[PDB]
């Protein structure tokens, strides 16, 4: 009868759908590797999908996925065991080397652009006429680390022009240079900005930007990575 045919057709449809969905979610990170970086024998049940090509706007070329995958950076890690499936110990400073929760990806060393081809993120001093509209204005507040030492002061907000939101605080250090801090890793309080991830002495180590009025996707990753990694790696100095 009709209902049995409908329900049976449906399960065949759903099985094709799940196949399609599984292979669509293999377009990044395949093929699988052994810990030594050689291709793994067992790639799983589904095969790699046929490549697809994104045409990036503003003349920035094309991406093809799946496509050739390399880290394009050295990984300062060593095996802790003689068999598959154990942790890899940092061989240096994991904060400096960009491993574990301090990891960054070699994204394009260009800034993300808005729909008009202008830099997406600018310091508020260069964005007419962006202002703080609500909440405490953090500009001028001292910045405290998790060791409860003062590390610097806020000298600007870097705003997303098209989405109208704060993304980074620009912080002046004791030596007069600045760093970006991600907005999602600070507590704006009435009389200070508190940073749990970093102790005062790790602020100088935040990766710097090559130009002072723009930040690139690569720089965002190095900065965000470094600050997140402090949760694990600066735990000795947190109170």
């Amino acid at each position: 009868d009709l209902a049995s045919l409908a329900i049976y057709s449906f399960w065949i449809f759903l099985a094709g759908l799940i196949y399609y969905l599984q292979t669509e979610n293999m377009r990044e990170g395949y093929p699988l590797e052994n810990e030594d970086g050689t291709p793994a024998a067992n790639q799983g049940p589904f095969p790699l999908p046929k490549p697809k090509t994104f045409i990036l706007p503003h003349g920035r070329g094309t991406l093809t996925v799946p496509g050739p995958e390399s880290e394009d950076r050295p990984i300062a890690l060593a095996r802790t065991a003689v068999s598959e499936g154990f942790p890899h110990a940092p061989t240096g400073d994991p904060m400096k080397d960009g491993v574990g929760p301090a990891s960054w990806v070699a994204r394009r060393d260009l800034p993300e652009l808005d729909g008009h081809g202008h830099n997406k993120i600018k310091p508020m001093k260069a964005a007419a006429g962006f202002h703080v509209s609500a909440g405490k204005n953090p500009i001028g507040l001292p910045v405290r680390g998790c060791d409860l030492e003062i590390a610097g002061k806020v000298v600007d907000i870097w705003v997303d022009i098209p989405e109208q939101m704060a993304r980074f605080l620009e912080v002046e250090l004791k030596d007069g240079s600045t760093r970006l801090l991600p907005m999602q890793m600070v507590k704006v309080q009435s009389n200070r900005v508190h940073v749990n991830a970093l102790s005062s002495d790790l602020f100088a180590g935040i990766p710097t930007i090559k130009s002072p009025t723009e930040v690139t996707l690569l720089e965002e990753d190095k900065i965000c990575g470094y600050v997140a990694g402090g949760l694990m790696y600066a735990a000795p100095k947190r109170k």
Partner: protein, 301 residues
């Protein structure tokens, strides 16, 4: 430790008039006010809205549906405002009785006002559908939103149009009433031998529960990786960052699944559309092909 559910600081710039592409700018309004209240959770800007021909047709048509019901609710309240507010949930615009079949010949006071209201609702939804398609075309975007919305239209069309026609009377349709449409829903299940035995109803539920599981996980994840600009999903698709890598690895280490930044949005659209897709098939087959889901379930077929 800040969680990123509400913004700590709002910033505001000049009103954003939006991208142009092939949009007829003659048909965009001016910007509305900026809500600081809204701006704690998302964007502060209201407007501009686009209103061309289909917009006004849909808006006029949809208000006529809304007013047609309300005129009938006032009539039932004997025009007393105290009785209108007391009995609001209990009023109902009922379809024509079974006698009148699929005829447009029923009197206003016994189903004609229902048909009028339904006509206005029909125009309102379909014009709004063309509008979701055309607004996407003007911006050169995929038609994903229009095709996903059709899934919702499928169940609404089954309930009020396609099924009443196959059964041979408008009496089988849904009344316009708060408590009365609830009673209809409960009544429907009893008359068809309990929908829990309808395998399509079972799947519909699986997808509804799964829509909640998936948006819970997806939202939670993007907030968990917003410290690496994770909500910037398009640039993470074009150029995988540590946000996409950490999101992928959470899923892999937890339950051995693969998830790409693009791929999770394919899971999302399908989990959702399959709710009303399977739903409408389950309702279509009820009383047309299957009297009684208990009895069907005993034979399996």
């Amino acid at each position: 430790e800040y969680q990123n559910i509400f913004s700590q600081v709002q910033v505001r710039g000049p009103a954003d008039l939006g991208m142009t592409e092939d949009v007829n700018l003659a048909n965009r309004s001016g910007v509305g006010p900026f809500s600081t209240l809204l701006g704690w959770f998302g964007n502060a800007q209201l407007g501009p809205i686009y209103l061309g021909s289909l917009g006004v047709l849909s808006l006029f048509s949809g208000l006529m549906w809304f007013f047609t019901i309300g005129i009938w609710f006032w009539y039932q309240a004997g025009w007393n405002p105290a009785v209108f507010l007391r009995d609001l949930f209990f009023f109902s615009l009922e379809p024509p009785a079974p006698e009148y079949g699929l005829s447009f010949a029923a009197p206003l006071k016994e189903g004609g006002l229902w048909l009028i209201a339904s006509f206005f609702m029909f125009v309102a939804v379909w014009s709004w559908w063309g509008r979701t398609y055309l607004r996407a075309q003007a911006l050169g975007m995929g038609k994903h939103t229009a095709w996903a919305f059709l899934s919702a239209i499928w169940l609404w069309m089954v309930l009020g149009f396609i099924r009443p026609i196959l059964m041979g009377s408008w009496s089988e349709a849904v009344p316009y009433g708060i408590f009365s449409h609830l009673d209809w829903t409960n009544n429907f299940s009893l008359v068809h031998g309990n929908l829990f035995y309808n395998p399509f109803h079972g799947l519909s539920i699986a997808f509804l529960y799964g829509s909640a599981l998936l948006f819970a996980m997806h939202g939670a994840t993007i907030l968990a990786v917003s410290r690496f600009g994770g909500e910037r999903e398009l640039e993470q698709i074009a150029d995988r960052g540590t946000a996409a890598e950490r999101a992928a690895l959470f899923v892999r280490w937890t339950m051995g699944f693969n998830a790409t930044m693009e791929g999770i949005h394919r899971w999302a659209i399908w989990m959702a559309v399959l709710v009303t897709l399977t739903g409408g098939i389950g309702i279509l087959l009820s009383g047309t092909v299957v009297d009684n889901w208990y009895v069907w379930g005993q034979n399996h077929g």
